[PDB]
């Protein structure tokens, strides 16, 4: 008999522009007269949360309420309370939440790497890779745009952040995008927008044309003779 509340993540405040916070309840049966509430620090009102989940088969129920909030005021560290009182638990409980102030705020430095020349040889497919290194804390959010409008998420694959071993407790990530190869030899700018909560304007954007690795000079020297 427990309650799990999920805080708003930066890969969701940035993706959906609608900072909000949920409250699911584990190991409580599928009964009526549910208490799900969201209060500020001072306990004032909140958004009307609906779309309660379905009755699970094993006699458990998670009444999920989604409530929004002004944008700064989540980051200012205002505590919220998910208060619960079911039938089996007529005694309440307040699952409290806050913004974790603390840990240092370093910013990513994003290098976008173009496909290997051994790969654009089979003339099959090019894997462009965005290497979001050096940052802290977690929750980077990488997405890809071609010429201005963002691509499908079916085509790129972001890893979850992994901690970097040479440097201290600062993560990295990476994200590959696999394009066709005839689409790449045409041109095709293909940029990598990387959202973090420690950048100046929150978003970095790097890009790769076809012409970005290409050598500065070819320097042949042919010595045909007869000796």
């Amino acid at each position: 008999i427990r309650v799990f509340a999920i805080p708003p993540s930066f890969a969701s405040i940035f993706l959906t522009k609608s900072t909000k916070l949920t409250c699911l309840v584990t190991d409580l049966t599928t009964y009526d007269s549910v208490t799900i509430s969201w209060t500020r620090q001072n306990g004032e009102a909140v958004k009307t949360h609906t779309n309660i989940s379905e009755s699970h088969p094993n006699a458990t129920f998670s009444a999920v309420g989604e409530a929004s909030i002004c944008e700064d005021d989540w980051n200012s560290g205002e505590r919220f309370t998910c208060t619960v009182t079911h039938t089996d638990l007529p005694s309440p409980l307040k699952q409290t939440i806050s913004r974790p102030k603390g840990v240092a705020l370093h910013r990513p430095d994003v290098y976008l790497l173009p496909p290997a020349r051994e790969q654009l040889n089979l003339r099959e497919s090019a894997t462009i890779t965005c290497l979001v290194t050096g940052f802290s804390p977690a929750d980077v959010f990488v997405q890809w745009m071609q010429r201005g409008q963002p691509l499908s998420p079916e085509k790129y694959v972001t890893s979850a952040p992994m901690p970097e071993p040479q440097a201290p407790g600062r993560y990295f990530a990476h994200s590959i995008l696999t394009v066709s190869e005839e689409e790449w030899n045409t041109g095709e700018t293909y940029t990598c927008v990387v959202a973090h909560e420690a950048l100046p304007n929150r978003v970095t954007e790097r890009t790769v044309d076809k012409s970005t690795g290409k050598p500065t000079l070819y320097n042949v020297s042919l010595v045909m003779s007869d000796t």
Binding site: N121, R123, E124, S125, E181
Partner: protein, 111 residues
């Protein structure tokens, strides 16, 4: 001369299916090296429509499969749902697209 040998001229009506076999000298490189079927377009080069490693292009997705019988010494390309954009000039081959080792099939669809 390049020792692959396919069908030089293929004829098939729209909607029907094609099976195109191409043969290779059954070495131990040629059994295991990459086998392609590229579309020699105009203005340049092969654009690999269906490789044998497992690429299958945006066009030929759902309608083509390339299999490989290395003991029989051949590889076969099945293409269903033809149309009249499936007409033109194709190559069945091995290894890299540029370096020859190929054969030139001329696919020609009829109404």
């Amino acid at each position: 001369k390049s020792p692959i040998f396919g069908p030089e001229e293929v004829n098939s009506v729209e909607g029907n299916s094609v099976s195109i076999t191409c043969y290779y000298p059954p070495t131990s490189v040629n059994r295991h090296t990459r086998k392609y079927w590229c579309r020699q377009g105009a203005r340049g080069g092969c654009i690999t429509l269906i490789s044998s490693e497992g690429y299958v292009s945006s066009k030929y997705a759902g309608r083509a499969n390339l299999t490989n019988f290395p003991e029989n010494g051949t590889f076969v390309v099945n293409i269903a749902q033809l149309s009249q954009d499936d007409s033109g000039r194709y190559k069945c081959g091995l290894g890299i697209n540029s370096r020859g080792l190929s054969f030139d099939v001329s696919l020609e669809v009829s109404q």
